[PDB]
Subunit: 390 residues, 4 copies
């Protein structure tokens, strides 16, 4: 954090040169009561490169900007086709571009960074183009603010391709300059439209991808001639899965993690659920880490049957978010009502009994389940719990 | 539905302020026979925030729009660089933007919503820019409609980057204003082109993706030097799969559902097929739910061989949509003709006989099949049908 | 094919009305020596709808275009704000749009179709806008070609947002018309740029995706500090796989086929290879169809070792495209040289011998292999070949 | 490399014709002291086609460009509507386009190639349009440089859609030409904006896709109400995986290789690790090639537990890049510290002992592991090591 202020100071120095140098080439009446900032800024540019550490095809912009190739032009009054090498300092902006595109490349969007850098370079180049236009004008008595204001008005009318045409070229050497900045204006405005069209194309990704996958599963299920009630129930399921976890599927988000982080996330999620069961209590610590990676999420809508009383039944369910209710076989007498953190279906792993009660959802549930075959497979390799459950 | 009319009333109030305030800053001859709508609209803005429920970095637009920071300007006749804070009411449009982008974010496309909101803000800002241009004109006797019509003509000629140039700036304080709205005009027109290019890029998704996957499997099969008859048959298969179910594959559409909805969809699809078989009749209800999730779809073209008489043969087929015919071993005597809802190949699960007849397709079929190994695997865990089939 | 000429005739009729009606509203000196084509075209429009077969929210454009709502205007000389309903015929273009977007929606690209239809509607609307501009001009003696040519020059200067400004509005009722077609011109030019940017964005798909996956596997393997010789060999492998089969992977192209077409493609590919082996000769026809679906493709570069003499060895290889050579254990005495259609490694399925010769590639091979476990798995369920190989 | 200079010479010849022919149609005072380059360039065009090897719908541009359809026009002084067929030579640019789009289609980006070719054709067409505009001018005494400079200024003002309007059409036959090049100017500028918007849309792919997958796994894990410490640890893991291997996952990059190249890459990666173990030393060469394809990469953050002392433990770990430390059961006495190239956990494959020490990471590790079941599965089919480990 003591070099970020140095990068800001270097940006201020090269910004200062980009605003000053084409303005003092046109008006040589400057630079004389303004040499001290040249001295300070030149020392900053010549002291940046040791603190930037020396010969590369990506170092010579800073190296050519470092040497005082100006101040000789302005003290010795070099003529017009030879003074222009005092723009060599403006190679410094490539270094500031390549530094600001990496010091904050993830604090912000990478497309918005390029667009703001382009708007900065377009204003900072419209200043230079206005200075050039004001340079190759007929010499006449005119106040030096109102003859810059017309040149900047011209070079904004040309670059933004509006083109009023109220002030136009007269001589041929103005017309050649006008042709070349019309090409540059069309190029810069094409780059601005291209970066805006790239920035707003990827602006909605999850909210467009979810709209696509709910149009796919609807235009398909209308082909199979499905009932409209069930189709409305599927559409409200996808509305739930958008307005809670933004459309993303649970088992493909946390597959993009490595094994220790995926284990840590599963340990944080199933935290206050697995310190409740009177089957895994007194078990080992290395047994919870084997069952907790094989839990699979399912989402039950309001009124769905999770367990029907009288089925064979295999697998146990852990409630994570929603509610559920437990009903008898006739669905008349309510036994109880379960909530988050609890669990049901535990009398199917250890025992070959058939289901004893009907478990209907009440709201959307987001509940995790553990299969019978998977539990008895990763129970075989731990012997003490293989004796503890018998 | 009694608050959606309130959102429409708030939109009408802030629309009213956005059309009125820059028009009454220019003409102070208004506001005196038009104060009652100021009173009504100010009460609406000051009563919206309790019915919007209080301090956040996303609440202060509505809070700054709520207080009557105008009406003091217009009753006390504040001067020109100080009256402009009566535009503080125009911060209300951020709240209406953020409300209309969520109350109907799935009734319509999310890109078309942004484009229509941008066109609304561009017209509603061209009004304010025309009022500003008409403000900093030389004062002269001119009817107040025809001097607004020229200012709006100017600010549409500038923002849509056409730029006739028939009426242009004269003073420097007009030229600075013209430079800044040329920048804003280029920005707004870049945003319009960017949103149109984003809206028409994703306009054909299924009809372009299907065109790509029929060009991939054609430019590949022309490398392998395949016969042109079979290549024409593959191309007409992909024409069938576009013009019936829009290109989407059956086993990857309904993998994006959870287990109860996928079970309900499979139960609705194989409804009038599984209450026909004299093998699964009298079976349990929990057995149909296990076989009905393991049916796999295949599509047979016209004239394809589904079953050849004399093969070993393993698996059973359920017809869902098309037709099929049953032929003898010499393919001369037609036994029968099957249709949708029926089934063939049932004498391969229970018995180790070889195929007894040749089953040729007639049109495209869309028929579901059940493997022998899968059926005998999920038949082992139900004992009563494991005795019923013996 | 006798209704496609009818669609072309209907397109010619509505094109005729779109070029004629705004030209005869301006000049009423027409229509009198040109009524017979009105009669013929009106009969075509009133006879299209029975041959188009009757009330829908997508049928009423053709129904409103069908009734002769003109010819009454032009015979009875209805005044200026009432004659304009003779543009109701121009609703017919929606029907021609919706017909031409489906009769040839796969003969051509779907984006190029929309772009050509947009260019057609933009020229066909610039005609109407030029007729309107020529309508609200001051009446003066001027030849009727050179006063249409200036109106069309104006409405192309405005719509393509160039805006010379050599001829401009004068009256207020011209200025309102100019504001509204400046908005339409900016919209049409935004749509043209959006469709061109959508048409050239997806223009290279396989040639950009392949460039991405050869930059991914290079920027990754430079992290692992891999040798440059092997990295050059991988890059020339990807150059081979572009310049033969356009980058696409063999086992994911023909997974997008159903089982009978995938079986037919594999039967056509391994045609002159499987009628050569003295192991599968005399075997059943239903055995070739089981082995021919389990062949897996691999590609060996020039000089790679396919088989090393003295290894354990399990699997057999079928050559499809390239060449290969067979060398002895010291790689000095060349046994033979194999070509396409032949096969090696056959003395590993039936026997537990170790490899007897070293098989080096010569060019790129594109050869298919069959594993030992897969062959002995799908050999167990056919008993007669399970006795034939013993 | 002796035909690339021929392609450059052909490009120079057709460039020469594209700059010369519309300039000599306007000025017939040329061609007389400039016939020798016509002779040389015509011989080059008539000798290219045998060295290009003869009748196709993609050969006739070169064939029509080959015959001297000019030089007869310029020696016999053909009149104005008949001289224009001397532009038939300009069909040669299609051949140069189709040759330069394939000789360097992978040295550079395919979109940048199309954009540079479009800028070349737009300048090279602005020359021809300026020559046509200068052709249909009123004949007057004016120096032949300053009347070309105004025509080129006009055709750059029109094509880049700026449109000053300082010089405009006068006659009708100029106005028809101006309408048609306004359409062409709008089309060319739409193509330039479309290619720039396509070139900058795909400019950041890996750096935008990685930003998306770290926003997905964050907006999901904020729904599950995860602790902020662990969420910060996941975000710094994704910062590591960007700033080392650019976001790409190890097991899906080298799945895009065939089996010999994937074997060669794994052999180069695990080179100085597998010639260290006192378990696989003295083993076969065909055993290293079977274990080295089943190594699976995992990445441990700083401070993670790789092995906990006292667990059951199954699998062995090979360190590739980072460091690690070995601690005792109380995590007080440090046994040693391991580095890259070494390995730990070897006393779990051969023996059923429980873990003997706790292995904590120090920095990010990038270490490869081998499961117990996989090792004992691919150890069963090699008998001599199955006796060597006992
Ligand atoms: C090249 C500009 C036109 C040069 C024409 C010129 O030299 O004019 C003579 C006077 O020179 C003179 O006083 C000096 C003439 C040149 C003074 C104007 C400098 C223009 C610099 C623009 C660079 C853009 C910066 C881009 C930053 C991203 C006469
Ligand atoms: C976004 C918002 C940004 C706003 C920046 C606007 C800056 C305005 C600062 C300029 C101050 C200003 O109002 O402009 C004139 C000064 O003339 C001058 O030479 C001014 C010369 C300065 C050059 C101005 C060009 C820079 C504008 C860049 C805008 C891009 C923004 C995006 C008016 O003079 P004033 O009324 O005293 O009477 C002059 C007398 O001769 C007749 O009345
Ligand atoms: C800033 C506009 C130029 C301000 C110049 C100005 O104040 O003019 C004086 C008169 O002021 C006056 O009567 C009052 C001058 C200002 C009256 C014009 C207000 C322009 C408001 C535009 C906002 C866009 C709304 C955007 C909505 C999305 C003289
Ligand atoms: C999309 C379709 C939208 C159409 C809206 C058009 C609104 C037209 C309403 C305006 C009514 C109108 O025709 O305009 C003039 C009124 O002048 C005026 O001050 C009118 C001043 C009102 C300001 C008009 C600008 C708003 C236009 C916004 C268009 C954007 C649409 C997208 C004509 O006067 P009138 O012939 O009596 O003779 C005037 C006399 O002095 C000489 O004949
Ligand atoms: C609305 C056009 C301006 C209407 C103004 C108008 O009616 O002018 C009067 C004369 O009317 C008259 O003779 C008749 C005036 C109207 C004659 C011009 C018709 C313009 C039709 C443009 C439709 C575009 C087609 C789009 C196809 C895709 C006076
Ligand atoms: C793409 C290629 C397309 C080319 C189409 C060009 C069509 C040209 C056909 C027009 C024929 C033509 O050359 O135009 C004039 C006729 O004036 C007229 O009223 C002509 C009026 C017809 C209206 C022309 C506008 C349609 C142009 C649409 C172009 C879009 C293409 C994309 C010249 O008259 P001419 O020299 O005898 O002397 C006239 C005398 O008064 C003075 O010399
Ligand atoms: C068509 C150009 C307008 C033709 C009009 C014309 O022929 O003018 C006559 C004189 O002809 C004459 O001397 C000769 C008139 C034509 C001389 C100008 C040729 C224009 C060629 C532009 C092609 C673009 C190249 C595109 C390259 C990609 C009078
Ligand atoms: C990107 C950078 C590219 C720069 C190319 C610029 C080329 C400039 C070469 C032209 C040389 C030049 O400066 O232009 C004039 C020559 O007039 C002429 O006929 C010149 C006629 C040549 C035609 C020029 C058009 C080509 C410009 C293409 C630019 C596209 C670049 C992207 C000035 O004459 P000069 O002062 O002696 O006094 C003339 C006397 O009559 C009054 O002083
Ligand atoms: N009286 C009860 N109170 C709370 N939960 C119950 C009760 N009876 C059954 N359950 C739960 O509901 C389940 C239904 O059958 P299971 O064997 O799956 O296991 C049962 C218990 O987990
Ligand atoms: N006479 C028949 N009528 C209708 N269907 C038949 C007839 N004979 C055979 N099939 C069906 O065609 C199938 C061909 O052999 P399978 O053993 O698969 O089972 C046979 C029956 O399902
Ligand atoms: N003399 C030979 N001529 C042609 N092919 C051979 C010869 N010897 C071995 N091969 C092939 O090369 C293979 C090397 O060992 P295999 O046992 O895989 O099977 C061998 C044969 O398929």
């Amino acid at each position: 954090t003591y070099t970020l202020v140095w990068k800001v100071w270097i940006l201020a120095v090269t910004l200062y040169y980009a605003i000053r140098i084409p303005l003092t080439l046109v008006f040589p009446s400057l630079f004389s009561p303004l040499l001290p900032l040249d001295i300070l800024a030149s020392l900053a540019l010549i002291a940046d490169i040791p603190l930037d550490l020396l010969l590369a095809p990506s170092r010579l912009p800073d190296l050519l900007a470092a040497l005082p190739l100006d101040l000789l032009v302005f003290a010795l009054h070099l003529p017009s086709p030879l003074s222009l090498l005092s723009l060599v300092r403006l190679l410094k902006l490539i270094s500031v571009q390549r530094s600001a595109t990496r010091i904050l490349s993830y604090r912000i969007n990478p497309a918005l960074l390029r667009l703001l850098s382009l708007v900065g370079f377009i204003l900072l180049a419209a200043h230079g183009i206005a200075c050039g236009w004001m340079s190759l004008q007929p010499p006449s008595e005119n106040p030096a603010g109102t003859r810059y204001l017309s040149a900047f008005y011209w070079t904004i009318t040309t670059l933004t391709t509006i083109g009023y045409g109220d002030i136009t070229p007269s001589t041929p050497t103005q017309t050649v300059y006008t042709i070349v900045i019309e090409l540059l204006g069309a190029a810069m405005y094409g780059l601005v439209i291209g970066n805006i069209a790239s920035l707003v194309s990827k602006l909605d990704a999850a909210k467009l991808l979810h709209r696509e996958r709910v149009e796919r599963v609807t235009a398909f299920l209308s082909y199979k001639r499905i009932s409209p009630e069930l189709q409305r129930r599927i559409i409200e399921y996808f509305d739930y899965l958008w307005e809670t976890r933004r459309g993303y599927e649970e088992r493909e988000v946390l597959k993009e993690l490595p094994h220790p982080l995926r284990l840590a996330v599963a340990m944080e999620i199933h935290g206050d659920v697995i310190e409740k069961v009177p089957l895994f209590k007194g078990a080992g610590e290395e047994f919870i880490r084997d069952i907790i990676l094989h839990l699979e999420p399912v989402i039950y809508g309001p009124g769905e049957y999770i367990i029907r009383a009288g089925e064979m039944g295999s697998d146990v369910y852990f409630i994570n978010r929603g509610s559920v209710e437990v009903l008898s076989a006739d669905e008349k007498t309510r036994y109880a009502i379960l909530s988050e953190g609890q669990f049901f279906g535990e009398m199917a792993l250890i025992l070959r009994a058939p289901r004893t009660a009907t478990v209907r959802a009440r709201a959307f549930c987001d509940l995790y389940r553990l299969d019978k075959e998977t539990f008895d497979r990763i129970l075989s390799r731990y012997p003490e719990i293989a004796a503890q459950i018998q």
